[PDB]
């Protein structure tokens, strides 16, 4: 109920003739393959990135795509033929597709989104238009409902041939799902935009995997006024996070940045304000402060 | 040059059988259409093949398609003298028309008496 | 029923002959071939509606021209002797499946 795997594919039509199409595939926070225009063969971003199958089946599923990549491409630019002159490129081209799968239970899924918005999907036996989606698109889907033989085949590859993979996958990539990397944190303030308020800042980088919690407190309380941030994302598979909390100025000492995560055990991380380790942390990183915010 | 047929012309004697050959190297080969041509007249379809192997019937013409070789053929049995004519064999890429046809250059079939 | 007209045309050298083809199937889709000795149909043009003409594989030497859903003219500007040729047409829906029209034979001369 916890793992979900998704083949992104981003694809971009300038005029009648330029184009350009690269995908990305995760299994929850984890890149796990890279196909680029420029290169004819998919590229394994794991050591792991064949799951368990066969060379003779992966190869013949990577040949597949390969003729799938080069079909879409006139394929779109014959649909924009067909509708023209009511759409015309710049046109770009998002699909999502792959497999959650809960614990042996899979739901399948195959997005489109036609210049950032949701727009078709794969449902059932057929491409169908979603609620909200433009009138224009009916005749499009007609005609590649028309092709029963792609329709054949992306059924296979959602009911059987998604889950089928992933589980192979997910056995294979164990170690590096459930790798553990502790966080660390540091303290920091910055002028609210609130006269006479100062705005307290928890970093805390470098964990693996991303649940986390961090709160401020005043002792026993949780300080309410705690702002969790976006989760954002290390160049090394790690996550970063911020958690704000607007004080009056005076009002830090005895507040407390804590941080519990799964690679601690129960050994929380905590940060006092006013301490002798802070005012250390702090001298190190002091700078003329030229381009603030 | 990407729908190819062999013989280029073959001749029978009536009442006997003839097989005629296609081979292609259409990507994505999505179906097989075989058509009679008389002389000056147009394109009469005889069958189409869609599965990946395929046999299929009309009468007395009967086709196979393999998908795997990417090679048809146009089975006549016992040919008639009006069944002397161009057979031309064409390939569809898609199931749809975003398709795009490709021919042969046809066969020439000539029964004798 | 797909017809088509003239059925044989002479024509000289730098005159505009214009091909008419006529299809009461209310087919979106109509197409432009022409037949030669050695190859199979090439296409010339095509169209997937009134108002649209797209390129084919052989264009040059052609202009096409869709005005309403059930006819599509093959217009030579500039007649050439490279475009003696037999020219068929052919209609379809959303479906793969394309249906020809009898053809027509078209001479160019000095």
């Known amino acids: 109920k916890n793992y979900t795997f998704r083949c992104l594919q981003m694809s971009s039509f300038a005029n009648r003739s330029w184009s350009r199409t690269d995908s990305v595939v995760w299994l929850g926070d984890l890149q796990t393959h890279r196909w680029s225009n420029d290169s004819a063969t998919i590229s394994f971003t794991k050591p792991w990135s064949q799951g368990k199958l066969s060379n003779q089946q992966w190869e013949k599923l990577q040949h597949m795509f390969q003729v799938y990549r080069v079909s879409f491409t006139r394929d779109i630019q014959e649909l924009v033929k067909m509708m023209s002159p009511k759409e015309d490129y710049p046109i770009e081209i998002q699909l999502s597709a792959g497999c959650e799968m809960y614990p042996n239970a899979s739901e399948s899924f195959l997005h489109v989104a036609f210049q950032g918005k949701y727009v078709v999907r794969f449902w059932g036996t057929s491409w169908q238009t979603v609620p909200g989606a433009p009138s224009w698109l009916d005749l499009p889907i007609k005609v590649l409902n028309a092709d029963q033989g792609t329709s054949a085949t992306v059924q296979m590859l959602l009911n059987d041939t998604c889950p089928l993979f992933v589980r192979g996958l997910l056995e294979a990539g164990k170690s590096d799902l459930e790798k553990q990397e502790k966080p660390v944190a540091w303290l920091s303030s910055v002028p609210s935009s609130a006269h006479g308020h100062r705005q307290l800042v928890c970093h805390v980088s470098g964990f693996y995997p991303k649940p986390v919690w961090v709160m401020w407190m005043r002792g026993d309380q949780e300080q309410q006024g705690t702002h969790r941030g976006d989760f954002l994302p290390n160049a090394d598979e790690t996550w970063y996070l911020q958690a704000t909390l607007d004080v009056e100025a005076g009002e830090e000492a005895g507040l407390a940045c804590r941080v519990k995560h799964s690679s601690l055990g129960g050994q929380d991380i905590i940060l006092y304000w006013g301490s002798l380790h802070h005012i250390l942390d702090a001298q190190k990183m002091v700078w003329n402060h030229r381009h603030h915010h | 040059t990407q729908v190819e047929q062999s013989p280029q012309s073959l001749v029978v004697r009536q009442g006997e059988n003839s097989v005629l050959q296609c081979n292609y190297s259409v990507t994505p080969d999505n179906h097989l259409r075989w058509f009679k041509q008389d002389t000056g007249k147009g394109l009469v379809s005889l069958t189409v093949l869609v599965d990946q192997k395929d046999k299929t019937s009309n009468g007395r013409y009967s086709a196979t398609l393999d998908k795997d070789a990417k090679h048809s053929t146009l089975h006549i049995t016992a040919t008639l003298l009006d069944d002397t004519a161009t057979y031309i064999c064409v390939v569809g890429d898609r199931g749809s028309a975003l398709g795009r046809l490709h021919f042969g250059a046809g066969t020439q079939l000539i029964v004798i008496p | 029923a797909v017809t088509q007209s003239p059925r044989n045309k002479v024509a000289v050298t730098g005159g505009k002959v214009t091909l008419s083809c006529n299809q009461t199937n209310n087919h979106n889709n109509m197409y432009w071939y022409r037949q030669d000795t050695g190859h199979g149909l090439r296409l010339i043009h095509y169209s997937y509606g009134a108002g649209s003409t797209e390129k084919g594989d052989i264009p040059d030497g052609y202009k096409a021209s869709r005005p309403s859903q059930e006819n599509f003219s093959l217009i030579l500007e500039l007649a050439t002797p490279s475009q003696t040729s037999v020219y068929f047409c052919?209609?379809?829906?959303?479906?793969?499946?394309?249906?020809f029209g009898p053809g027509t034979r078209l001479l160019v001369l000095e």
């Open positions: 052919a209609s379809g829906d959303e479906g793969y499946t394309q249906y």
